[PDB]
Structure formats: structure tokens, C-alpha cells
Amino acid sequence: PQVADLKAFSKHIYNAYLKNFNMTKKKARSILTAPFVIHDIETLWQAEKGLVWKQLVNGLPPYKEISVHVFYRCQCTTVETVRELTEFAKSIPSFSSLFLNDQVTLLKYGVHEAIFAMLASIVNKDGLLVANGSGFVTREFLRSLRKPFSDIIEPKFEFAVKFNALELDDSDLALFIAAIILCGDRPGLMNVPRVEAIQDTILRALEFHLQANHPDAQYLFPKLLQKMADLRQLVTEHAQMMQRIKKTETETSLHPLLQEIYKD
Numbered sequence: 286p287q288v289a290d291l292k293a294f295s296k297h298i299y300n301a302y303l304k305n306f307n308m309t310k311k312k313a314r315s316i317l318t319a320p321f322v323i324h325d326i327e328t329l330w331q332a333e334k335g336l337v338w339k340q341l342v343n344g345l346p347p348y349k350e351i352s353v354h355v356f357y358r359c360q361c362t363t364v365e366t367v368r369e370l371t372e373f374a375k376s377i378p379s380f381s382s383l384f385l386n387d388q389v390t391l392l393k394y395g396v397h398e399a400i401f402a403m404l405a406s407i408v409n410k411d412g413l414l415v416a417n418g419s420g421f422v423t424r425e426f427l428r429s430l431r432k433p434f435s436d437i438i439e440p441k442f443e444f445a446v447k448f449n450a451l452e453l454d455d456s457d458l459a460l461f462i463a464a465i466i467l468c469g470d471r472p473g474l475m476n477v478p479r480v481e482a483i484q485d486t487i488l489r490a491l492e493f494h495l496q497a498n499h500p501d502a503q504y505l506f507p508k509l510l511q512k513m514a515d516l517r518q519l520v521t522e523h524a525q526m527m528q529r530i531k532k533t534e535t536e537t538s539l540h541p542l543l544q545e546i547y548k549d
């Protein structure tokens with residue numbers, strides 16, 4: 286029953302993944318191998334005028350400085366990805382079967398881990414794609430921002446480069462992300478056994494998918510479990526840096542949805 290049942294299960298989640306995420310790793314890698322390079326104030330200014338963003342510039346807070354503007358651009362991209370992760374989750378029948386409060390709990394504590402995991406898809410050692418792959422913001426430019434804003438993004442690059450060395454494709458990622466969302470460990474969950482059961486099914490689907498898709502990649506599955514653990518620490522460290530900013534930079538605002546996610 287299992288292997289055939291789980292291949293169908295995997296196929297469905299892969300389809301949900303393709304349906305709800307505009308930028309695939311496949312699409313991203315092709316571009317990363319002709320986007321407009323953002324590497325300083327002038328080119329970002331030109332990008333804001335030239336490129337097509339999902340969130341219009343006039344919708345963002347009034348311009349103060351480059352570091353804070355980038356910080357707001359990060360929030361915009363995050364909120365957009367959270368929107369897609371929500372529809373991705375809702376496109377998974379077992380997820381949508383959960384009570385709505387549990388759905389919210391899983392998304393609340395899950396999306397940032399998933400975002401940092403998916404972030405690698407549009408990242409190389411030199412920078413990351415923005416504006417639907419129309420732009421490419423350099424890693425050095427992001428390093429050049431003033432404290433505390435420069436230190437937030439660099440750890441995500443470090444994780445991504447190691448993560449991309451595993452060479453997962455979109456079919457692997459769909460299951461990997463699904464396993465991050467449907468996680469029985471989240472605080473305040475109502476029906477833990479049910480979520481743990483779904484999570485187990487996804488992980489069994491993944492281990493079989495990896496054997497079929499990556500037959501010669503030894504220890505690939507336990508390595509990915511470790512990355513799931515690593516992502517929890519990355520998010521923990523991220524939340525601390527975000528907290529530092531709210532305290533020290535009282536002038537800067539936080540998007541209301543993100544306020545709710547960080548409410549604790």
C-alpha cells in the first residue's frame with residue numbers, strides 16, 4: 286500500500302506547490318544562470334522606479350534611510366510569501382481538515398522556517414532575486430547596511446548556501462515545506478496526535494520520494510531532518526534580532542500581520 290499511496294500523496298503536494306508559488310527553484314536557477322543588479326542607493330532608486338514590485342512604493346512608510354527601507358522591503362516580501370504559504374497549506378486536504386485555530390497555529394509558528402527554507406531557491410553566494418526575478422540584490426550591499434539591519438540577513442545566506450548544496454528540486458521542496466508547516470511540536474496546538482500523524486505521512490512520503498528522485502544521494506533524508514532542526518534555531522535567532530530592533534529602533538514600524546506572528 287505505502288510506496289504507491291505516498292507517491293500519489295507526494296504528487297498532490299507537488300501540484301499544490303506549483304499552483305501557489307510563482308517563483309519555482311527551477312525558474313529561479315535559470316535566471317541566476319537577465320535581472321537588474323541592485324548594489325547601492327542609486328541602483329535601488331532606479332529599481333524602485335524601473336522594476337515592478339508586488340507592493341507599491343507609495344504603500345510603504347515614508348523614506349528615512351536605506352537600511353530601514355530595505356527592512357520594510359523584507360517585511361513586504363515576507364508577508365507575500367506568508368500569503369502563498371497559507372494557500373499552499375489550504376491546498377493540502379489534510380491541513381484544511383484541521384480546525385481553523387490549529388491551521389492558524391501551524392502557520393504562525395511554521396511560516397518563517399518555511400520562508401528561510403524556500404529563500405535558498407532564489408539565492409546564491411552573491412545575492413538574491415527580488416521583484417519576481419526582475420532584480421538581483423547583492424549580498425555585499427545587504428552587508429553594508431547599518432547595525433542592526435546588516436546582521437539579520439547574512440545568517441540566511443550562510444544557511445542557504447549549505448542548503449543548496451543538497452541540490453533539492455521543487456518536488457523535494459514541496460514535501461519538505463509541507464513537513465515544516467504540519468509539525469506537531471508547535472505551541473498551543475489543540476489536536477497534537479492528528480498533526481503528528483499527518484506530519485509522519487509527509488515524512489514517509491519524503492523518504493520514499495528521495496530514494497526515487499535521489500537514489501545515489503546517501504544520508505539525504507536524515508540530513509534534511511537536521512536542516513529542519515537547524516531552521517528552528519535560525520528562526521529563534523531571527524526573532525531575537527527582530528526583538529532587538531523593535532526595542533532599539535522605536536521609530537520603525539512592523540507590518541500588522543507580522544506583529545501577530547511575533548505577538549509572544
Ligand SMILES: Cc1cc(SCc2sc(-c3ccc(C(F)(F)F)cc3)nc2C)ccc1OCC(=O)O
Binds near residue numbers: 354355362437438
Ligand atoms: C528583516 C527581515 C529579514 C529577513 S531575511 C530574508 C529576506 S531578505 C528580503 C529582501 C527583500 C528585498 C530587498 C530589496 F529589494 F529591498 F533590496 C532586500 C532584502 N526578503 C526576505 C524574505 C526576513 C524577514 C525579515 O523581517 C520580516 C519578518 O521577520 O517577518
Ligand SMILES: CCCCCCCO[C@@H]1O[C@H](CO)[C@@H](O)[C@H](O)[C@H]1O
Binds near residue numbers: 384386387390473
Ligand atoms: C474552528 C473555528 C473556531 C475556533 C475557536 C477557538 C479559537 O481559539 C484560539 O485559537 C488561536 C490559535 O489559532 C489561539 O491563538 C487563541 O489563543 C485561541 O483562543
Ligand SMILES: CCCCCCCO[C@@H]1O[C@H](CO)[C@@H](O)[C@H](O)[C@H]1O
Binds near residue numbers: 542
Ligand atoms: C494568515 C495566516 C498566518 C497568520 C499568523 C498570525 C497568527 O496570529 C495569531 O492569531 C490568533 C487568532 O487570531 C491569535 O489568537 C494569536 O494571539 C495571534 O498570535
